[PDB]
Every structure is written in structure tokens, then in C-alpha cells.
Design a protein around this nucleic acid. Sequence first.
DNA 1: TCGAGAATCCCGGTGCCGAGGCCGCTCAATTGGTCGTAGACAGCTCTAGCACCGCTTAAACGCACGTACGCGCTGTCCCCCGCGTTTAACCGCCCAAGGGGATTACTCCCTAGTCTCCAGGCACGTGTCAGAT
DNA 2: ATCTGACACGTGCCTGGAGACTAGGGAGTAATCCCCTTGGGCGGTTAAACGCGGGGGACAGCGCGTACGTGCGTTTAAGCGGTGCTAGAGCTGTCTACGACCAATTGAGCGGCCTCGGCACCGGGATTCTCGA
Lengths: 94, 85, 445, 77, 87, 92, 89, 99, 88
Amino acid sequence: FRPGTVALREIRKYQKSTELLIRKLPFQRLVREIAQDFKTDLRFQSSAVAALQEAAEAYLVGLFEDTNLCAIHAKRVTIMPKDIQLARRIRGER
Amino acid sequence: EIRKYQKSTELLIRKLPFQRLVREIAQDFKTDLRFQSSAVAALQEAAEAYLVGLFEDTNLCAIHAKRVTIMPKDIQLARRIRGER
Amino acid sequence: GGQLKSYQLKGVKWLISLWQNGLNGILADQMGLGKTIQTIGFLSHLKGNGLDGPYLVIAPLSTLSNWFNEIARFTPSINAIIYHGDKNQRDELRRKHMPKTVGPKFPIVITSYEVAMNDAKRILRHYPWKYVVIDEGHRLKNHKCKLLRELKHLKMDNKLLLTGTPLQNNLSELWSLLNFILPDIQVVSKLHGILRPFILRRMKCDVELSLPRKKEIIMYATMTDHQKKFQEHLVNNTLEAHLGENAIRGQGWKGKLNNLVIQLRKNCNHPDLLQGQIDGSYLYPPVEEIVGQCGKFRLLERLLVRLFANNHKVLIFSQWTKLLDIMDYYFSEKGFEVCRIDGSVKLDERRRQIKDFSDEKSSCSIFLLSTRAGGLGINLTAADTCILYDSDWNPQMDLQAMDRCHRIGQTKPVHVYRLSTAQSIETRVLKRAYSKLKLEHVVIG
Amino acid sequence: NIQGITKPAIRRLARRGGVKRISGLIYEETRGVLKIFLENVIRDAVTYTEHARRKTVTAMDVVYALKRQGRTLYGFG
Amino acid sequence: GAKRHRKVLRDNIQGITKPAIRRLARRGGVKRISGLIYEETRGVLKIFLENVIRDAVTYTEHARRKTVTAMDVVYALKRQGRTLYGF
Amino acid sequence: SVETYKIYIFKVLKQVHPDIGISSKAMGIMNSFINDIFEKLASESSKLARYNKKPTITSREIQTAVRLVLPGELAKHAVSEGTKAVTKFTSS
Amino acid sequence: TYKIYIFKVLKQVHPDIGISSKAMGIMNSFINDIFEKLASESSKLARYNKKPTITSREIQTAVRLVLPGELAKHAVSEGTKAVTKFTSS
Amino acid sequence: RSSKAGLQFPVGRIARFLKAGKYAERVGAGAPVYLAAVLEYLAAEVLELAGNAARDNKKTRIVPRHIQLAVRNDEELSKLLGDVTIANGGVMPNIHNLL
Amino acid sequence: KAGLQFPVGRIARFLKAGKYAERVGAGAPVYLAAVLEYLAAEVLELAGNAARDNKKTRIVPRHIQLAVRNDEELSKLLGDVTIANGGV
DNA sequence: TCGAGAATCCCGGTGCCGAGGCCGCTCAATTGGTCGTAGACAGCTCTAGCACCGCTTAAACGCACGTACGCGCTGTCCCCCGCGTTTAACCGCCCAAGGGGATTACTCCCTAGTCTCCAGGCACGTGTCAGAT
DNA sequence: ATCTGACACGTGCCTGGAGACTAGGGAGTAATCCCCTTGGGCGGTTAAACGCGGGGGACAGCGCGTACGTGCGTTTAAGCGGTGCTAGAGCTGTCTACGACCAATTGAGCGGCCTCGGCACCGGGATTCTCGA
């Protein structure tokens, strides 16, 4: 096809689905690694990591919608890092 | 003029206009109401602070689009990311 | 007479007698001349009297190839199909045979434990199966295994189990199987009353000649002072600090729980395993003499120098793959040429390595080889000596290894060197594996 | 009484924030965003007041409302 | 089979593959994505997670326990403004 | 062993939409939404008690807490549903 | 209220400075607000977890869950030292 | 008591919770009734909107995807669940004219 | 009482009042006093230091604001404070 | 233009598994006297909020004028996307002997709230002495 | 240099502190048992890595014109000061009518057990949406 038409295909299917992205095993490795710092020797139930993953995905999707708004404000379509840096500054996140 | 008001701690709106607006917008919720002369002061301090922040984020939003002239699009992009009506 | 030959026929007779009683049994002939040849015998004996009916045979994959090849024996009358793979099976699903009609046409169904388990639906529809035959009974030694749950959905009017090692771990595996073979099912004699009717274990008495008799000898080693220090710091919860002084790439991966039996076994194998995992130290112990801080390593080295005095090729086994790796590092520094096949290496890659190791010309004596490796048919009879650098909770595994070199084609007499360390969990494990061999040895009675 | 928030004042506030050059349609927008804010805080204040059987918006009513909305206000009471 | 080289492992963070960031972005409505975006998303994920896990590990210890349950995570999120229904 | 409003959330549904099912994993959200709205209101009304220095959470308080949590027109139609009920309970 | 103590803390840290009247107000407000936050947090952590008492442990978790960052890591040390001195003596 | 009023939610169970939740020393008699009548109203609204949603997708049962959608659609119920993240609920479609 | 400047007794009383819970331990009053004291000390230090820059011998609302704004921790605890009679 | 083809969209038919169903039983919600206490409310004092006047002067307003910035248009070249092919990526199911778990139900103790007396801090009153408006 | 905040000593009143009980929650222990441990096996298969064009896209430069800032002379109307008036905030004292509590009573709703219809799945057939020339 012509670049950009299969991309609008993907922004429709995924907005309609409710199936989670991110493989389950890598996220669970990451959380554990991040945890060996606050307290050494700690175990995690499965439901906990599930919840954490759900929340994270939502956070990132929201950030991604506001970083698209910011980019459009500058008369572009490509979202660049400066848009991540502008959006977070307006929302207060560290 | 940027430098001057960045060193001062004085009030920037006049007094009585702020009083009347606050009395009217209350009228819609309750008729015949009184207001301690300290309440209208708190309400002014807070409002003035709020507007300064909005303006500081709108300036950021304009520097993004490579301008220096704030415009109404900017206030709106700021009040949307920040999650407001 | 008039069919096959000795070391069999009576086995088919037992199977036909079972058919008469309709009871389901578990042939367990010693792993010798039988299996595939005997398996087809009974069904082949159905021949004209009964070549019509649902027939199913589940087995691993190599075993599936083998059964298929063998079915090319005398009387190639009954048909057969290797229902293997997925989607390609879909095309042969209906093409191979009709859903219900079974004339002489019906080809024997030969599937795998995955296929059987994953898509039992397809085969669930078929009629009460005349005889489902499961090659390796040990697969079902757990009564909560998902294969067992999916294996009950099949409507089976008869069952059969092939094995050579009925019990390995304890009696509960006998219990779970007995539910499978017979749902209905001093004291030693009382057990022999229940089991005499079904079990038919013909020893290597019928097929003798097991090559020169093997020698299995345990040569202990004395835990050195660097390992004792590690062990005490690990007796409690101190190993981390005594080793956390540098804290490079994290202070002992900031965390250490584990189970004493295996964190202290890892020590008794080689302390580097702990040191590497604790401090980053991206560089292996380069002194190449700190590898000699392990007592068990030093006893291996001297053994090997005395066994190069003759050059007869050795075999090395281990439980993990980090430890074989340390060994390889050590020897490769000195310069020895090594070949290695663990589970990480690929299949066709490992098959050529053997074809080279087995090269009559090639002389890479040192061959690293994991224990649970699936390479039974490796058949490297070129090697003559096996060194079990570790123990194994289930003794049968070790025995399989013994077979991997003690098989046909080994003219030279074989030794076995089960290394170990005194005053530690290695000696504990040896006692456990010994009592498991004894559990099976009184059963052999 | 919202035209009493006159053009020079908005400009002064804007130079506190950092703005440099104001446009010409920025004023009406400012006058709207002030009104919304003032309308929320005052509603909450009048609620709190009535709850105390009074007729006088008073000390700690406004402060409490402003807190309620993420804006702690120290002093003023 | 190496000398000083032992057996190295990648960063658990590099586990979030570029394909997965793209899929999360397209669900947010983005069209063309840049190349300096991926190394930026990773940091903002890390920060979020670090604030939540810290609260969960606190709420746990107070119960004398050593396992982070789902209820500890739900409370951390509620302290941060995000409320999760369904656990 | 686990108290829940599932029984009552399915009675209101029937009353509003006669012929529509609810499914499990969907009343696992509706129960949570009720528990949370209860908590908020009660806590507000306690703070509103401790503040007004009274030891009793009465109806007046619950009402001023509703007016401050439930946002917008919901309030009005909730307040009504609720007051209606208190007068009704009174003439029993 | 806390005037004397805030006047005392100042004399100790900056021996020669004074403080106006509006400043004292801000300071007292700050102290009271921190107090209330800390205590509310501690209470909630007790209704749930099923306990009728607010022991020290809850004063510490509360300090960790609300004081942001290293600012807390110190406050915890400062509180532990003072409860230890009081208990031993 | 639930019966004396027209409420369908349980008055007694709410009263008990309020009295046993250390919410205050003495709860009155009307407070349990008012709370029940507000909680019932809110639930009815949400459920009524969610139900209108399903029929559209041509299904006769509600799933978390429906409640999310309903909440996102209406303004007041959104100002209320301004941060809530329903599990397995997806997002509401939104592609700008930049196409 | 024994160790600090703040009024361990009064803090305890305030905990008894307000009905924060049924029972209050013995250490609970002692710990809170110390934390509040530390927090006040930090703020009073930066402000005076702020006043040591402006050279003003008297701490005024402006200094407190400036100090809170600068330091990275207090700016986080004190997220949106609007000190009365202060400025940016 | 118009087709050529590829993504999109029905009909059945499938099972086929969770959405409704029922049912004793336990405990939790009613209903009745007490049993005080917490509530309303009636009345009085006096603070402070509102209305209005007159005058000064500072901030707001209107209009003219110049020019800096915003916006459209153009051209170059970097780098992102789509596709096909080859590697990893995950995910499933299994070892086996261990512990770690965490939950419940077991049992007494020292400290909470409770009194009760009695001390001396702090809120408020008052005189001095400066320092930044 | 002064007027505005300091800054200092006292009356007393209001707190804290101390001493004790009967109480009574929490620290201690035992138990059972069940999800949770480090290292490996083998077989699936779908997602992820890589490479290569080529079409976008983002970015820089230039030019016109219009809307913004500055300046100066009118004209508002805010700020201050002072006077008068009364609504209503704040507090006190009486006495009851909402509450807690206990006990007797028992039907509503709750854990585990039924079943069957709508919903996930499609394969086959059918229909519209790019695109290229």
C-alpha cells in the first residue's frame, strides 16, 4: 500500500480491542528488579503484578494522547521527545 | 516590566470589582448572603495565584510552537492537559 | 512355533491372555530385546481375526519414527499414519481416513503426548478405542498432570502401559499408575499378590551378555577452607556481607533467599557460582588456580591427568550448565579440545558433533554432557569412562547415563567415578539415591 | 461586573507569569477562566456556610474550599 | 566457551520491546512515531513503577508479612490519584 | 463470608432494563463503585461531624456530604430521591 | 499555641535573627497541617488492619507514606532516636 | 426499615456499617435512609446508561467494556470517575482530522 | 518533656481529643513531637538563610516562600501553598 | 475511471460453558422497655458589615504612528514505514526435595482508660527599645 | 527617626503530671498446609530483529502586511476619611425526644449444588475500500 494507510488501520483495531499488550514475563522481571532496591528479599503474588501492569499501560496511553495533542499544536504529525517533556511538565509528574 | 513584578508582592487587580463578581456568582446558589472582609481577600489572593500559573504554562505552550505571542489556543492546550473544564 | 522367535511370543501370549480377561496390564521388560517388536506382535496377531477397530499408540517423537519404521516387517498388510505436526495434520485429518468407517483401510494412528494432549477433541470423536498403548508410562507418574485429565476424555474400552522402570521416586507413582491400568485398584508378599497377575518384567536373564561388567566407585573429596568459610556464612545469613564489600553490579543482586539444600550444593559444586552471581566481576576467575580452590575440581584434575596417562576417552556429567561451563573454561585455557551437547545447543548441530566425536580418527577425548540431556541415542561407545561430577535425587537418571556409554559396542571395560565431598549435602544425597536404588532393588526381588 | 477586570490588569498578571507579547483575543478568555474558578470555589464555600446555619461567608469557609480543590491556603485565618 | 567473558544478560528494561511501545502509542491515537521516543518512554515507565512499588512494599511490611498482595497495590494507586476497579 | 450488594444491584437492573443480563466480572465493578461512593460520603460526613464538633452523623450532614462528592446534576436527583425517602420513612 | 517553641527552635538554629508576626502565623499553620495529615494517615491505617490502638509503628509508616523522599529518611531516624532515649530513661 | 421506605437497597446493613466503621459516636435514624436512597439513585443511572450501550453492540448482557463506555460518554459520571481505570475496559475511539 | 523542645504533653492531649482512635500508645506522642520539630527546624533554617541573603534581620512571609520554592524536597511536600502576603 | 484486488462484512452451524436456579441454616436484622444524653430553642449583648457622602489623584481610556512578528510558500534531504525473510522471543508442561509461606486458632500480661489529687506551665493580660518603612 | 512592630517582665488561672486500680488487648506459641523456592529438561509457534528501498515528512529561508507596543492628552472612579444604623454572630440556661443498650425472635440472604441458552467461532459467500495510471 502507500505508507500511512495500514497505520490508521492499527489505530482503529487496537482502540476497539481490550486485550493487553506487553508480554507478561518481561514486565514481571522488571518489577522484581525494581523491587530488590526498596526492600531486599520480597515475594509478589501474581494478581499484584497483574494490577501493576494494567495501571502502567493506562498511564502510558494517556501520556501518549496528550503528547499527540502537543505535537499537533506545533503543526506536525510525528510525536518527538520534546512533546513527552512538555506534556509531563504541564501535568506535574516528576 | 517583567523584572519589576517578579520582585514585588503587591496586589494586581483592584478591590471592589472582585467583590461584586464573587457576590453575584454566589447569588445563583443562595440569595441575600454576607461576606467577612477577609473572605474577599482570600478569594483574591487565590485567584491571582491561579492566573499567574496558567499564564506561565501558556507561555511554555507558545515557546513550543516557535512563537512569542501568547494566543487563545495556548490557554486551551494548557487547560486540557492539566485536566480542567 | 510358526511365528517370530525366542525372548518373545510368550509376551504376545500374555497380551492375548489379558485380552481374554480384558484387564489391562503394564509390560515392563528390562530395557532389552523386545519393545517395538513385541508391541506390534499382539496387534499384528489381530491380523485377519481383527484388523478392523480403532487403534491408537502415543509415544515421544523419535519413538514415533521408530515404531513407524519397524511396522515395515513381515506381513505389511495393515496401514499406518504418523499424525504429526499441526495444520498439516488438519489436511490429513479427513484425508487419511473416514471419521467412523474402519475396514481394512483404517491406518494405525501414531501420535505424540503433545498432540494427544493439545487436540484430544479431534480423536475424542472416534469410537471406543480397541487398545490405547502409551509407550513411556513414567509420563503419567503424576496423578494431577494435565495429560491425565485430557486422557480420560477419550472413550477407552481397554488400556495398556509400556515401561521399563515402573517406580523410580516412591510408591505414589505406582499408585497413580494403578488407577490408570486398573481403575478398581510380610506385607511384601501381600503386595506381590496384587501385582503378580498384571506386571510381566522379563530380566536381562533371557538376553544375556551386557559387555564387560561395569565398576561404579565413590571417591570423596575434602571440602577446602574457602568453601567452609562460604558454608558457614551461608549456614546463617551472612554470606552476602562477607561478599558484599565490593558490591560491584549490585550488592549480591541485592537479595538472597533460595533453599539451603541447593545454595549449599552450589557451593559444594564450585564456589564461583555464588561469587559470580553476587559481585559483577564480568571476568571469570582468571587466576586459573582459583578454579583449583574447589576440592572436587582438584580431584577431577588429578584423576584426568592419570586417565590421559592411558588416553581412553572420558565422559563428564552435571546437573546444571553453569558448572560444565566453568569446566570448559578451565580446560580450554590449558588447551584441550572439548565437545559439548547441553539442552541449549540445537539438535542437528549436536548430531554432527557426535559424528565427529565418534570419528574413529577424531580424538577430542573430553566430552561435556548434561545429564537430563535427551541424547540417549548419542551411543558414543568411543568413550570408555564416565565421571558423574554430581548426584541426582532420582537414581534412575544416572542409570540412563550409564547406559549411554555402557551400551553395545564398548569393547573396553568401563569405570564410573561418582565424585563427592564428605561432611556435606553431597554425602546426604548419595544416601537418598542409594535408598531409592534399594526401593527398586527389593522390588526387582 | 466582569468588565471590571480591565485590560491593564490581565497584562500585569501575564508579565508575572513570564509572558512577553500579549495578543488581542487573550482578554475574553482570561475573563472566562476567572469566572469558572470563582464560580466553583464560591459554590463550595456557600455550601459549607449554610451547613453551619449562617448567613455570612466567613473565616475558614473559603480556606476549606480552596483546600478541597488541591489548593491549600495557609494564613487567612 | 570464552576466557574472562562469562555469560552476560540483557537489562530487564530492554525487555519492553520497541514493537510494544508502538502498539501502546497507536491505541493512543498517534500516527508517525520518531526514533528518540523509545529511549524516552522507558524512563517514564520506570519512574511510575518506582513510586508505586515503594508504597506497596511499605504497606506490606506493616502487616509483618513478606508478600506484596493485590490490596497493597490498590491502596498505593489510590494514594496517587488513580483508582482501579476490579483488582 | 463476603458481604456484597450483588443481590440488590441485579434488582435495580431488572427494574430499569427488564430483559438484559449483567454477567459476572461486570458486577465486580458495580459493587466496587458502590462501596467507594459509600466510603467517600461517610468520610466526608465524619470530617463534617468532627469539624462541626458534634458527635452525631445526622441527615443534614449526609446531605451536605452528598452535595459535595456526587458532581453536578447527579446531586440534585440524588438529594431528591433521598429526601423523599426520609419523609416517607418518617410517616410509617 | 506553638509560638514559644517555634521562637525557641529559631533561637537555636539562627541565634541572632528575629521573626515578624505574619511569619509566625504561617509557621504555626504549617505545623498544624503537618500534624493533621500525619494523624489522619495513622488513623486510617488502623481502622483497616483491624486495631483500636495508634502505636508508634503507625506514626512511622505514616511519616514514610506522606513525608516525600530523603526528607522522610531523616525524620524516621530523628523519631527513633527520641523514642529510644525516652524508653531507656 | 428498607420496606417502610421505597428503597431496594438494605437500610439495616448500611446502618450497621456506619455504626461499626468508627465514622462517629452516634448515628441518627435518618442518616441510614438518606444514604441508601442516594446510593440507589447513582447505581440506577450507571446501569441504565450501560444497558443502553449493550443493545447497540447487539448483545443482551453487560460487560466491563460497556460500563467504561457509558461512563466516558456522559459528562457528570465522568467528572465523578475522573481517574478510575476499569479493568479490561478498553478506550473510547478518537481519531483526529489530521487524517 | 525529656529530650525535645516541643510539648509532648499537649501533642498527646490533641491526639486523645479529636478521637483519632480508641487508645494512644505512649511512644506515639513522643515520636510525633520529634518529627514536627525536625520539619520546623529545616524550614526556619532555610528561611533565615534566605533572610541572610537578603540580609534582612527579620524573617518575613516572602522569605519563607522563597525557601519553600527553592529546596527540592519542601517544594514537593508543599506542592501548591500560597503563603498569605508573599510572591514569586 | 474503472477496475483489480484486498480489507470488511454477513449468514448460518457449531458447540458448550457460564448466567440463572434452589435450597436449608445461621446469624443478623427487628421490636420493646429502659435509660440519659444529646439535642433544640428562647433570649440577650454588642461586633462588625453595609450604605452613603465629599475630595484628590492615580490609574484607565482613546487615538495616532511605526515596525516586529506570524504566516504563507518554496525547495532540499533525512529518516520512518511497509514488506519479506530469518531469529528469537515467549509460553506449556515436567522435575523433587525442599522450604518459604501466611492464616487460624490456640493462650495470659502488662498497659490502655480510668479515676484523683495537685502541681506550676502557659495562654492572656502589662512596661521597656529599637529598625525599616 | 519614627511609627511600627518588635521586645520584656508579672497576675493568675487553667493544664500536665503522678499515683493507682481492676481490666483486656497484644506478644507468644503451636499448627496445617499450600502457594512459592533455584536450576535444568523438550516442543510450539508467534512475535521480534534485520535490511532495503522510497515516499513521505520536517526544517530553513524569504517576503509581505497587519496587529501589537509606545506615547500623550482627557476622563473616569477607586481609595480614604468619616457618620450612622442594625442584622446577626456568639454565648447562656432549660428540658426534653431522639438515641444506646440489652434481650428475646427468626426470616432473609449466603456457600455449595444444578443445567441450558447466548455467546465465541467460524468457513463460505458477498460487499465495499485503496490505487494506480
